[PDB]
Amino acid sequence: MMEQVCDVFDIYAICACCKVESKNEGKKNEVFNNYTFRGLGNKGVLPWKCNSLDMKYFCAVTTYVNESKYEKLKYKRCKYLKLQNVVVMGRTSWESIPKKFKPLSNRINVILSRTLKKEDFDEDVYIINKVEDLIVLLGKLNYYKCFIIGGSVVYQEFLEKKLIKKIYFTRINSTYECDVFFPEINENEYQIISVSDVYTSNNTTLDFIIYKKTNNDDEEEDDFVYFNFNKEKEEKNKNSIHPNDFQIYNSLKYKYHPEYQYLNIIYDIMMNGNKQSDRTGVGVLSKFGYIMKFDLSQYFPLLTTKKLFLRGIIEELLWFIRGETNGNTLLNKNVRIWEANGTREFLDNRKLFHREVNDLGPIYGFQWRHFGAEYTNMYDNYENKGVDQLKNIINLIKNDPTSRRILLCAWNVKDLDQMALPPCHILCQFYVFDGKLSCIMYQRSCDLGLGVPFNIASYSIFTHMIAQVCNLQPAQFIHVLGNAHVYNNHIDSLKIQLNRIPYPFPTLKLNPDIKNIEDFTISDFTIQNYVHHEKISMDMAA
């Protein structure tokens, strides 16, 4: 009955917007949102000069054509009246391009000039004086899809004009000085339905998202139904958890951003979890056995759907590497991760009656550097006692990289009961190939709301640390979850969190002068270009 113009002539927008130089109140509590990425141009060029992968994406999207679908499209376009896509740009933009790469290859180029007229453009490029003139020009042409590509105000002229069907939008995750903003996309008009894998090109991370116009072989298909004949017409926590709760999450089609490996596991435990009591007395939803993989060559996987802070987590890791068991070393730096596990009362309830407050016993650090040595107190001298696993793994990686025995184990069975509590991060295995280091960490118990997000960062940083001091490049961090759980108190915060759309991940920089694993200090670590959503108190109370 009714159908809109954009949908009929298949009219699209494709852009790339970087972060924009600013100056703010004082502190860097800089709130991020979608308008964060708006930088289109600087003085006739891209604010970043050159990006080999966005270029490959642009050329891929604006020259891809599917002939065997044209029949349907032609039929559509005529019902009011070699195949190539149409690209459309403003004048500034067309003169920004070298004559080398003009006209744009395999594309019907179409410029908007109120000025110079048709009869001097010597190729087969078209020209039109107004945006309603394009519509008529697509009537007289055989083309697949039409792509607006061109300058601030050409795009601007479509918030009200509503001729765009989808925005193909590259997020370039780095700050450049910019002459031209991009129009503020109205959340009520266009909504994101797809997010890509995160990449590294030309010394920045970037991802590709898709906004869509809001509306406010045949045989073997039955065989699939047949093979699914023994499902349930329901879920499990359909009695607990509702559909409409995950409206933005469920609305997405392509969820390829690596942050979805974490969010999807939350989803899976919420929808399919098993309801259990536990040691705490808050209950959980639990499942058993998952795996995530992060590509550290391309990004640093610091969750972006909430705010995470890493000073504490980095000090803790530095404190593990030194071999320390002294809770006080962390408390004097206002790192309080282990405080509650070092109190008189907590140690008493563990039957550690003869243990000094904050003497956490032969926990991670003592096992990494002194496995099997007899623990006394947090102040004794342990130099050259026990097995220095940490040193042994760095020597294996350097000298026998194809060894299958490169493991770092904290689960010392003899010593569990002397620990303030037994370790969650059971062990680390390493794999080296083609100058690259990959790390698996097995976690026996995984608090998906609070713990896991830090656990990922922690072992990613460590995989970087281990790689730099071994003259290797980081490849994958691989996280295996044993008993994976969402505390009930976290459920509401995590519903909120699943409905947020990830930003491209940050990068981690290490001070490259550090060549020995003992030699890192807090200042040697820098998280760059961390774009993130607002913090979530995971227990929303007090």
Next chain:
Amino acid sequence: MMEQVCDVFDIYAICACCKVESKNEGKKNEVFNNYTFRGLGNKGVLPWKCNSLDMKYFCAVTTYVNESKYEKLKYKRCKYLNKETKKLQNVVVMGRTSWESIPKKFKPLSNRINVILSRTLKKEDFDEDVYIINKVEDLIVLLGKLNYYKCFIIGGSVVYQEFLEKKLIKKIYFTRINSTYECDVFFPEINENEYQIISVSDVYTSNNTTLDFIIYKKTNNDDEEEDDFVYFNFNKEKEEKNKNSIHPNDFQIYNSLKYKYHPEYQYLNIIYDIMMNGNKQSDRTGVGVLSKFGYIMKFDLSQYFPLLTTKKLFLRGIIEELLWFIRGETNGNTLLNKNVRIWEANGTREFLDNRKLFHREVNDLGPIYGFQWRHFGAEYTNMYDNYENKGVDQLKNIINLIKNDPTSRRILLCAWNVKDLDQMALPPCHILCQFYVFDGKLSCIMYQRSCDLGLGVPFNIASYSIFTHMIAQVCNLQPAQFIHVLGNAHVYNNHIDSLKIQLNRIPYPFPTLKLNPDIKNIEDFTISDFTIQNYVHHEKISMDMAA
């Protein structure tokens, strides 16, 4: 090249076959093939009497229609007959004898058009809303006159026989009932030039037998969605790592299959993935490998025992091993005296000396798996010592925890004792076991740091599946999942040709494991408390073809 009758009128076969009683004389070793599964009936009824799940599948396939596709099917059938153009149903077609063994309460089959082949009876002999036909040609005539989705031949062996002989079946939906029963009626031997398996289901248990569902195919003797997928796939290049050393036709059958849902494919796909994308690397061994890092398999022990089927495996050895572990033994002589040699090479004078264990007696393997399970932290002396009450008896602790603190996230069994690694004949590959109890059911994750896919993993799966059963039983729970995590996952080069062969065999329904139910303590099990039932498998593959 024009249209056959079975394609136009969508004529299919669906059956269930069990295994059939016999006796073997040259070797007790039974040979198995597709024709292993051929029992259809017995004294007028099903050989197994009843099977709820096969029933439920039968009902799903023979009553499922998609209204959206009928318009097109009409056209197809109208265009072939040279003709133009209440809820839609399927046809089922059966022999008279099959009709006569169906109870009246189920007759005619609900929500389906029933058609009965008979010479000796005619429509007057039936009260029921059914079509009678007296030759095969008349079914074609009828199907041309009726409105229907698909047409399923539902048996009689006489009916299956003549319909397969005339090439009138487009696919066979074949249920493999993996048990043996008395039979007098048989399904015809299929012709593998005429019909190829293209899909294999998950494996299930129903009514005290496993079963799966396969599909044979007749051999030839809002939609702006697709485009975004192509965009997001703009940076994945077209070739694979070793594809130029690993050739398409070497996986002809493997890759010809459409749905590979049998749980054995979790193993077979990891092999495939290492062959195609694995890293070429040297190793401790000198043989070199293809390797990758980080995989997970899951097997549902409530539904089957995942003993691989695409090659022959025996378990006496790995069961004796496991019992030896449980007793806490480190004496390799104990196994050799049971003619189990799994630990033999690791125990020689030479091997021990090359590990620098010059003061270790031959076959004294040191503080390995069993010692760590029963005495972690104790000082190892020799294999004859009495270590009673020394070290942490981890095995007893996890049983206690499973019984009395089932929701603990600390039920772990760890063999990687970092202090004792060098005193071991060799360091452990199966590093740890973690347990999980929900709803009277026990799952097990085992993490394996180093995984020989050709040779060890198949035994490793088996081992830890039995141990999940043993532990579950002595804690009064039901076994649920065995979950297997592979770290360094590798294919030895010498094994490739042999795995290329294995990846093109089609799995059989898995067997079942039963344990003596009287054993209520983990230490009281003996070899004869274990039975593998209904193991159907392809032939032995020696992985060294150089042997």
